[PDB]
Amino acid sequence: PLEVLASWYAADLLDALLMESLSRKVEISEIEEIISLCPKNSSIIRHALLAKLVLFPENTADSLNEVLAAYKNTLDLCSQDSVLKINLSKLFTLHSCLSLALQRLGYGDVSKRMYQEIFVPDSDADITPLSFIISWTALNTFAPICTSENDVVEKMAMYVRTAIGTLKIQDLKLSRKLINSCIDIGS
Amino acid sequence: VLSPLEVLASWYAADLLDALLMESLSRKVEISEIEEIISLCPKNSSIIRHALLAKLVLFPENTADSLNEVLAAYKNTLDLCSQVLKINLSKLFTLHSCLSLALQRLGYGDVSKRMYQEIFVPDSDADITPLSFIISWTALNTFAPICTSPKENDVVEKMAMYVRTAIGTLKIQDLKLSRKLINSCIDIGSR
Amino acid sequence: GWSDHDELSTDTTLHEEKFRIEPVPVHHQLDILKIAVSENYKTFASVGLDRCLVVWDLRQWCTKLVLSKEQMPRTLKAIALDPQGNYVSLFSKDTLFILNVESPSLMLQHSYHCKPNSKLNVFWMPGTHKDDEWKNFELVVVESSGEIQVFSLTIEIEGADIALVEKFQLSSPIIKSISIVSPTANRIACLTESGEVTVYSKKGPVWSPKILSQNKNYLTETKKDIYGIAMADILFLARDSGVDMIDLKNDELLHSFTLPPIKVNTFSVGVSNSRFVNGQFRVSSISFCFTHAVTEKVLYYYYGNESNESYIILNKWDQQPNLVDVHDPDNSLASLTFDELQENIHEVEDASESVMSSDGLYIFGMRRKSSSGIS
Amino acid sequence: ETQVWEVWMYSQSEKKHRSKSLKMYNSLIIADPGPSLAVSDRCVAIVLGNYVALVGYGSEIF
């Protein structure tokens, strides 16, 4: 019953840390604070590691391990104690987050072809800042390489443009996302 | 939503497909038989993908061109799935190892082994179909001489105990594959 | 711009009474990309980010046509409209569509040359005319390559017919160029990034390029942009040294209005009261849109006096003394030498997005001081 | 979103400025105004997201 509430505070502490990763340069010390603040095997403990895998390319190899270990762990204590519960938005979330993590590991000869077949959700209210930061930083890290299919960049950029819900600052910045989408239309 | 004619087409196809997988183990198999299957399978069903995953495994030069359709059917089965998924452990493992197998046959090695080493082999339940068996056999085959090298964290042992338990619950014939499988256990224990 | 209910302060003036603002409920599924418009003003056309097509009537306020994205090709680099507004053209990179709106039918489809991904520019040119009974068009296709295509396109209700005619291949990449049809004759302006200002002109069968004389005093300048009035067939030409107002056909530089240095991609001109008395093309007032180069505040310089104070002998139809005897109400109005034109300052924040009126008579625009959520 | 928009005008013929408020509650539009284009001498149309503002004075369109 406690670790539920600890998971809540680490949840709100992460949703606030991802939105600051766009305006300011953010450092690993803030993420490891959220990870230890979190509980052993919770929900937000998996999302926190994803944030680490996305927000820090200099720490992807070690990070990718910690993600796949926390998932190889969530699975072991599902059968040994057994049906999965994933929605399309969290599929697309892990989908992109892997391809971005593998572009950063040099296998981009593969990571491109994986990014090409991503099913991108539509426009809806449900859109956690974790999936937004991933979809944004993955769109950027694949805006140049992906031209040789090209549907993803446009679909993924529209996914980001098609929403906000927070105060502008960054009013001209989102507009820049719009015009960039426009030149993407002009391609 | 399927009529009453295509349900029988799928049952007939599912038995021929199971027949071709077990026959491929002690005879020489081809795609000419799978073309007849997929065409016999109705145009939008689970049996399509099973017919495809069998074509991906049983035909290795056609990996590149059969992986195309395996993804097409799955990106299409996802396509109408919104316009919530519920996948089984053995289904994940089957797709998992089948992709690992398809990638090694492409020339990824590293990427093929790492995905192979992260396969979550199911325990040992009733979910044993000749397709899941044929995949795990041929994948154990094309990967036992590669993942057996690095020593520390591997599933080679777990994978071979899967094909064990598998042979004794369904195929029940005969000492042929059983000898090779016991030899695989020898390949694991001696490693 | 939908909102659950728009509101504005209740008017206390007839100055604001006739002033009005209305929605068109019809909409793209997604945000707008680019649009084009008929000279008639009756017709309008539009495209979104989803690249759905929509066309709409202004006065009768009734739906004309709609097209979903999946009815359309993945690439849509360009768009163009006939001056009548009775017909529509679209440029996918490989093949162009030509569709009627008033009579929705597939008038034509036709593959055309391209050099991707150089930026497009496009110009319609009406033919010897006979609408509706029979028609023709001259499709200019300007390119950043500096190639400038021109095409025959005679069209009749029987079904659009098509044939290629010529391929201009102008030197150097281009900043800007525009169509300019005098009622007497077709003419087309062409600025270079080199700053050269060539003009092709239709002497019937003849299609003659000519080298307009930007003169020696400021040849070196990077240009901001030329702009002119095609109905006036008069060439305004941006420079920080003073804009040209060069004559066409018989062609000469006239005068340079005194100006502050001005930002590139900003210059444009508008005039009240088109008329063509005694062969002259005088207008009641003239006005001048541009963003400022430095302060970057929006600026719209005004010239002319009026309502009865002045008449604009812009150019002269014939730069010669003349004594034709027909009524000239403007003669009662004071003559305008350039000296008394006297620009009227009204510097304004860039934040207030705004445009000069096409007649130049009035300013209009808006901005969001603030906005908030449902909470 | 609710939106406190700012209409205003400055006639040259009168050399005169005026303005109006323009509320927009619950707008789904997010974009800045533009590209703009006058729909007549007395009236102008302007991009606002997918929607287009239409404004005019003395217009027969209304």
mmCIF file with all atom_site columns, N, CA and C in Angstrom, chain C residues 20-61:
data_model
loop_
_atom_site.group_PDB
_atom_site.id
_atom_site.type_symbol
_atom_site.label_atom_id
_atom_site.label_alt_id
_atom_site.label_comp_id
_atom_site.label_asym_id
_atom_site.label_entity_id
_atom_site.label_seq_id
_atom_site.pdbx_PDB_ins_code
_atom_site.Cartn_x
_atom_site.Cartn_y
_atom_site.Cartn_z
_atom_site.occupancy
_atom_site.B_iso_or_equiv
_atom_site.pdbx_formal_charge
_atom_site.auth_seq_id
_atom_site.auth_comp_id
_atom_site.auth_asym_id
_atom_site.auth_atom_id
_atom_site.pdbx_PDB_model_num
ATOM 1   N N  . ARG C 1 20 ? -17.287 43.755 -39.743 1.00 0.00 ? 20 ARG C N  1
ATOM 2   C CA . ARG C 1 20 ? -17.881 42.447 -39.486 1.00 0.00 ? 20 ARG C CA 1
ATOM 3   C C  . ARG C 1 20 ? -16.822 41.357 -39.563 1.00 0.00 ? 20 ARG C C  1
ATOM 4   N N  . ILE C 1 21 ? -17.141 40.191 -39.019 1.00 0.00 ? 21 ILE C N  1
ATOM 5   C CA . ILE C 1 21 ? -16.225 39.060 -39.061 1.00 0.00 ? 21 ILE C CA 1
ATOM 6   C C  . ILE C 1 21 ? -16.948 37.726 -38.966 1.00 0.00 ? 21 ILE C C  1
ATOM 7   N N  . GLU C 1 22 ? -16.809 36.887 -39.986 1.00 0.00 ? 22 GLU C N  1
ATOM 8   C CA . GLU C 1 22 ? -17.511 35.618 -39.944 1.00 0.00 ? 22 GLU C CA 1
ATOM 9   C C  . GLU C 1 22 ? -16.649 34.416 -40.304 1.00 0.00 ? 22 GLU C C  1
ATOM 10  N N  . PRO C 1 23 ? -16.909 33.280 -39.645 1.00 0.00 ? 23 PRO C N  1
ATOM 11  C CA . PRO C 1 23 ? -16.496 31.903 -39.943 1.00 0.00 ? 23 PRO C CA 1
ATOM 12  C C  . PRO C 1 23 ? -17.056 31.316 -41.235 1.00 0.00 ? 23 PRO C C  1
ATOM 13  N N  . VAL C 1 24 ? -16.283 30.458 -41.892 1.00 0.00 ? 24 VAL C N  1
ATOM 14  C CA . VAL C 1 24 ? -16.863 29.412 -42.729 1.00 0.00 ? 24 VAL C CA 1
ATOM 15  C C  . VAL C 1 24 ? -16.775 28.093 -41.957 1.00 0.00 ? 24 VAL C C  1
ATOM 16  N N  . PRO C 1 25 ? -17.931 27.520 -41.618 1.00 0.00 ? 25 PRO C N  1
ATOM 17  C CA . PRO C 1 25 ? -17.995 26.275 -40.848 1.00 0.00 ? 25 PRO C CA 1
ATOM 18  C C  . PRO C 1 25 ? -17.269 25.112 -41.512 1.00 0.00 ? 25 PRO C C  1
ATOM 19  N N  . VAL C 1 26 ? -17.285 25.076 -42.845 1.00 0.00 ? 26 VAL C N  1
ATOM 20  C CA . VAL C 1 26 ? -16.629 24.010 -43.589 1.00 0.00 ? 26 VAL C CA 1
ATOM 21  C C  . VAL C 1 26 ? -15.138 24.096 -43.326 1.00 0.00 ? 26 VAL C C  1
ATOM 22  N N  . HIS C 1 27 ? -14.476 22.949 -43.220 1.00 0.00 ? 27 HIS C N  1
ATOM 23  C CA . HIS C 1 27 ? -13.097 22.933 -42.771 1.00 0.00 ? 27 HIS C CA 1
ATOM 24  C C  . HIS C 1 27 ? -12.294 21.729 -43.235 1.00 0.00 ? 27 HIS C C  1
ATOM 25  N N  . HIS C 1 28 ? -10.979 21.915 -43.304 1.00 0.00 ? 28 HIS C N  1
ATOM 26  C CA . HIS C 1 28 ? -10.054 20.801 -43.431 1.00 0.00 ? 28 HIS C CA 1
ATOM 27  C C  . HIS C 1 28 ? -10.040 19.994 -42.148 1.00 0.00 ? 28 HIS C C  1
ATOM 28  N N  . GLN C 1 29 ? -9.722  18.711 -42.265 1.00 0.00 ? 29 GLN C N  1
ATOM 29  C CA . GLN C 1 29 ? -9.576  17.848 -41.098 1.00 0.00 ? 29 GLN C CA 1
ATOM 30  C C  . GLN C 1 29 ? -8.418  18.335 -40.232 1.00 0.00 ? 29 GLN C C  1
ATOM 31  N N  . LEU C 1 30 ? -7.476  19.031 -40.862 1.00 0.00 ? 30 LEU C N  1
ATOM 32  C CA . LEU C 1 30 ? -6.208  19.400 -40.243 1.00 0.00 ? 30 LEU C CA 1
ATOM 33  C C  . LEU C 1 30 ? -5.718  20.741 -40.770 1.00 0.00 ? 30 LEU C C  1
ATOM 34  N N  . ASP C 1 31 ? -4.694  21.294 -40.131 1.00 0.00 ? 31 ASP C N  1
ATOM 35  C CA . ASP C 1 31 ? -4.290  22.681 -40.363 1.00 0.00 ? 31 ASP C CA 1
ATOM 36  C C  . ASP C 1 31 ? -3.855  22.991 -41.798 1.00 0.00 ? 31 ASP C C  1
ATOM 37  N N  . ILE C 1 32 ? -4.102  24.229 -42.214 1.00 0.00 ? 32 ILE C N  1
ATOM 38  C CA . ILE C 1 32 ? -3.872  24.694 -43.583 1.00 0.00 ? 32 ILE C CA 1
ATOM 39  C C  . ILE C 1 32 ? -2.397  24.692 -44.001 1.00 0.00 ? 32 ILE C C  1
ATOM 40  N N  . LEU C 1 33 ? -2.137  24.350 -45.261 1.00 0.00 ? 33 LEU C N  1
ATOM 41  C CA . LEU C 1 33 ? -0.814  24.500 -45.857 1.00 0.00 ? 33 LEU C CA 1
ATOM 42  C C  . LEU C 1 33 ? -0.696  25.762 -46.703 1.00 0.00 ? 33 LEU C C  1
ATOM 43  N N  . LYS C 1 34 ? -1.437  25.806 -47.803 1.00 0.00 ? 34 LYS C N  1
ATOM 44  C CA . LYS C 1 34 ? -1.310  26.900 -48.755 1.00 0.00 ? 34 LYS C CA 1
ATOM 45  C C  . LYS C 1 34 ? -2.589  27.043 -49.591 1.00 0.00 ? 34 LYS C C  1
ATOM 46  N N  . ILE C 1 35 ? -2.810  28.223 -50.167 1.00 0.00 ? 35 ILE C N  1
ATOM 47  C CA . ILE C 1 35 ? -4.053  28.531 -50.879 1.00 0.00 ? 35 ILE C CA 1
ATOM 48  C C  . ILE C 1 35 ? -3.824  29.426 -52.087 1.00 0.00 ? 35 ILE C C  1
ATOM 49  N N  . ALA C 1 36 ? -4.874  29.594 -52.885 1.00 0.00 ? 36 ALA C N  1
ATOM 50  C CA . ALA C 1 36 ? -4.837  30.451 -54.066 1.00 0.00 ? 36 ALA C CA 1
ATOM 51  C C  . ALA C 1 36 ? -6.229  31.016 -54.351 1.00 0.00 ? 36 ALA C C  1
ATOM 52  N N  . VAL C 1 37 ? -6.303  32.092 -55.133 1.00 0.00 ? 37 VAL C N  1
ATOM 53  C CA . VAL C 1 37 ? -7.558  32.820 -55.264 1.00 0.00 ? 37 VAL C CA 1
ATOM 54  C C  . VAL C 1 37 ? -7.806  33.407 -56.654 1.00 0.00 ? 37 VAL C C  1
ATOM 55  N N  . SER C 1 38 ? -9.071  33.389 -57.064 1.00 0.00 ? 38 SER C N  1
ATOM 56  C CA . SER C 1 38 ? -9.535  34.032 -58.289 1.00 0.00 ? 38 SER C CA 1
ATOM 57  C C  . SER C 1 38 ? -9.560  35.555 -58.205 1.00 0.00 ? 38 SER C C  1
ATOM 58  N N  . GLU C 1 39 ? -9.337  36.208 -59.343 1.00 0.00 ? 39 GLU C N  1
ATOM 59  C CA . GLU C 1 39 ? -9.448  37.660 -59.434 1.00 0.00 ? 39 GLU C CA 1
ATOM 60  C C  . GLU C 1 39 ? -10.882 38.127 -59.241 1.00 0.00 ? 39 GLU C C  1
ATOM 61  N N  . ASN C 1 40 ? -11.827 37.260 -59.584 1.00 0.00 ? 40 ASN C N  1
ATOM 62  C CA . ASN C 1 40 ? -13.240 37.592 -59.487 1.00 0.00 ? 40 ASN C CA 1
ATOM 63  C C  . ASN C 1 40 ? -13.685 37.812 -58.048 1.00 0.00 ? 40 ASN C C  1
ATOM 64  N N  . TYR C 1 41 ? -12.919 37.229 -57.129 1.00 0.00 ? 41 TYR C N  1
ATOM 65  C CA . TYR C 1 41 ? -13.175 37.245 -55.690 1.00 0.00 ? 41 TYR C CA 1
ATOM 66  C C  . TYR C 1 41 ? -14.321 36.306 -55.324 1.00 0.00 ? 41 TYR C C  1
ATOM 67  N N  . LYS C 1 42 ? -15.168 35.983 -56.295 1.00 0.00 ? 42 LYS C N  1
ATOM 68  C CA . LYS C 1 42 ? -16.279 35.068 -56.065 1.00 0.00 ? 42 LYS C CA 1
ATOM 69  C C  . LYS C 1 42 ? -15.818 33.653 -55.722 1.00 0.00 ? 42 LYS C C  1
ATOM 70  N N  . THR C 1 43 ? -14.693 33.247 -56.294 1.00 0.00 ? 43 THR C N  1
ATOM 71  C CA . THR C 1 43 ? -14.191 31.890 -56.121 1.00 0.00 ? 43 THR C CA 1
ATOM 72  C C  . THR C 1 43 ? -13.093 31.826 -55.062 1.00 0.00 ? 43 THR C C  1
ATOM 73  N N  . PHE C 1 44 ? -13.025 30.723 -54.324 1.00 0.00 ? 44 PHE C N  1
ATOM 74  C CA . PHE C 1 44 ? -11.880 30.504 -53.449 1.00 0.00 ? 44 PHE C CA 1
ATOM 75  C C  . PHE C 1 44 ? -11.500 29.028 -53.356 1.00 0.00 ? 44 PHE C C  1
ATOM 76  N N  . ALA C 1 45 ? -10.216 28.780 -53.089 1.00 0.00 ? 45 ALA C N  1
ATOM 77  C CA . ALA C 1 45 ? -9.657  27.431 -53.014 1.00 0.00 ? 45 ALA C CA 1
ATOM 78  C C  . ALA C 1 45 ? -8.651  27.305 -51.867 1.00 0.00 ? 45 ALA C C  1
ATOM 79  N N  . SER C 1 46 ? -8.497  26.093 -51.342 1.00 0.00 ? 46 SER C N  1
ATOM 80  C CA . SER C 1 46 ? -7.672  25.874 -50.159 1.00 0.00 ? 46 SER C CA 1
ATOM 81  C C  . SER C 1 46 ? -7.229  24.423 -49.958 1.00 0.00 ? 46 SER C C  1
ATOM 82  N N  . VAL C 1 47 ? -6.101  24.258 -49.261 1.00 0.00 ? 47 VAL C N  1
ATOM 83  C CA . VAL C 1 47 ? -5.509  22.951 -48.959 1.00 0.00 ? 47 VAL C CA 1
ATOM 84  C C  . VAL C 1 47 ? -4.886  22.932 -47.558 1.00 0.00 ? 47 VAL C C  1
ATOM 85  N N  . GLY C 1 48 ? -5.106  21.847 -46.813 1.00 0.00 ? 48 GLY C N  1
ATOM 86  C CA . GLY C 1 48 ? -4.530  21.677 -45.483 1.00 0.00 ? 48 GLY C CA 1
ATOM 87  C C  . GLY C 1 48 ? -3.207  20.920 -45.397 1.00 0.00 ? 48 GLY C C  1
ATOM 88  N N  . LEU C 1 49 ? -2.749  20.653 -44.172 1.00 0.00 ? 49 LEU C N  1
ATOM 89  C CA . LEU C 1 49 ? -1.601  19.772 -43.934 1.00 0.00 ? 49 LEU C CA 1
ATOM 90  C C  . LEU C 1 49 ? -1.897  18.339 -44.350 1.00 0.00 ? 49 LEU C C  1
ATOM 91  N N  . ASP C 1 50 ? -3.167  17.976 -44.266 1.00 0.00 ? 50 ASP C N  1
ATOM 92  C CA . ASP C 1 50 ? -3.646  16.674 -44.700 1.00 0.00 ? 50 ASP C CA 1
ATOM 93  C C  . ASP C 1 50 ? -3.827  16.692 -46.210 1.00 0.00 ? 50 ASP C C  1
ATOM 94  N N  . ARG C 1 51 ? -3.630  17.880 -46.772 1.00 0.00 ? 51 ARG C N  1
ATOM 95  C CA . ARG C 1 51 ? -3.678  18.133 -48.209 1.00 0.00 ? 51 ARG C CA 1
ATOM 96  C C  . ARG C 1 51 ? -5.032  17.818 -48.832 1.00 0.00 ? 51 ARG C C  1
ATOM 97  N N  . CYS C 1 52 ? -6.085  17.867 -48.026 1.00 0.00 ? 52 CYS C N  1
ATOM 98  C CA . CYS C 1 52 ? -7.432  17.791 -48.565 1.00 0.00 ? 52 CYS C CA 1
ATOM 99  C C  . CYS C 1 52 ? -7.715  19.070 -49.332 1.00 0.00 ? 52 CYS C C  1
ATOM 100 N N  . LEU C 1 53 ? -8.441  18.961 -50.439 1.00 0.00 ? 53 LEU C N  1
ATOM 101 C CA . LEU C 1 53 ? -8.798  20.151 -51.204 1.00 0.00 ? 53 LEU C CA 1
ATOM 102 C C  . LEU C 1 53 ? -10.187 20.649 -50.834 1.00 0.00 ? 53 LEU C C  1
ATOM 103 N N  . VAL C 1 54 ? -10.361 21.965 -50.816 1.00 0.00 ? 54 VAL C N  1
ATOM 104 C CA . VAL C 1 54 ? -11.678 22.548 -50.582 1.00 0.00 ? 54 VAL C CA 1
ATOM 105 C C  . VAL C 1 54 ? -11.852 23.790 -51.440 1.00 0.00 ? 54 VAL C C  1
ATOM 106 N N  . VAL C 1 55 ? -13.033 23.972 -52.023 1.00 0.00 ? 55 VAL C N  1
ATOM 107 C CA . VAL C 1 55 ? -13.324 25.221 -52.722 1.00 0.00 ? 55 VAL C CA 1
ATOM 108 C C  . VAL C 1 55 ? -14.728 25.714 -52.403 1.00 0.00 ? 55 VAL C C  1
ATOM 109 N N  . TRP C 1 56 ? -14.848 27.039 -52.360 1.00 0.00 ? 56 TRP C N  1
ATOM 110 C CA . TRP C 1 56 ? -15.960 27.717 -51.703 1.00 0.00 ? 56 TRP C CA 1
ATOM 111 C C  . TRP C 1 56 ? -16.307 29.045 -52.378 1.00 0.00 ? 56 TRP C C  1
ATOM 112 N N  . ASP C 1 57 ? -17.592 29.396 -52.353 1.00 0.00 ? 57 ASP C N  1
ATOM 113 C CA . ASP C 1 57 ? -18.072 30.647 -52.930 1.00 0.00 ? 57 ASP C CA 1
ATOM 114 C C  . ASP C 1 57 ? -18.223 31.701 -51.845 1.00 0.00 ? 57 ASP C C  1
ATOM 115 N N  . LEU C 1 58 ? -17.863 32.933 -52.176 1.00 0.00 ? 58 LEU C N  1
ATOM 116 C CA . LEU C 1 58 ? -17.772 33.973 -51.169 1.00 0.00 ? 58 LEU C CA 1
ATOM 117 C C  . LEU C 1 58 ? -19.090 34.680 -50.886 1.00 0.00 ? 58 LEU C C  1
ATOM 118 N N  . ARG C 1 59 ? -19.811 35.033 -51.945 1.00 0.00 ? 59 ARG C N  1
ATOM 119 C CA . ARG C 1 59 ? -21.045 35.800 -51.798 1.00 0.00 ? 59 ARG C CA 1
ATOM 120 C C  . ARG C 1 59 ? -22.284 34.944 -51.547 1.00 0.00 ? 59 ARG C C  1
ATOM 121 N N  . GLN C 1 60 ? -22.381 33.823 -52.253 1.00 0.00 ? 60 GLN C N  1
ATOM 122 C CA . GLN C 1 60 ? -23.539 32.951 -52.129 1.00 0.00 ? 60 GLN C CA 1
ATOM 123 C C  . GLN C 1 60 ? -23.415 31.985 -50.957 1.00 0.00 ? 60 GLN C C  1
ATOM 124 N N  . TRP C 1 61 ? -22.232 31.947 -50.349 1.00 0.00 ? 61 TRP C N  1
ATOM 125 C CA . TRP C 1 61 ? -21.997 31.203 -49.110 1.00 0.00 ? 61 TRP C CA 1
ATOM 126 C C  . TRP C 1 61 ? -22.466 29.751 -49.146 1.00 0.00 ? 61 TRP C C  1
#
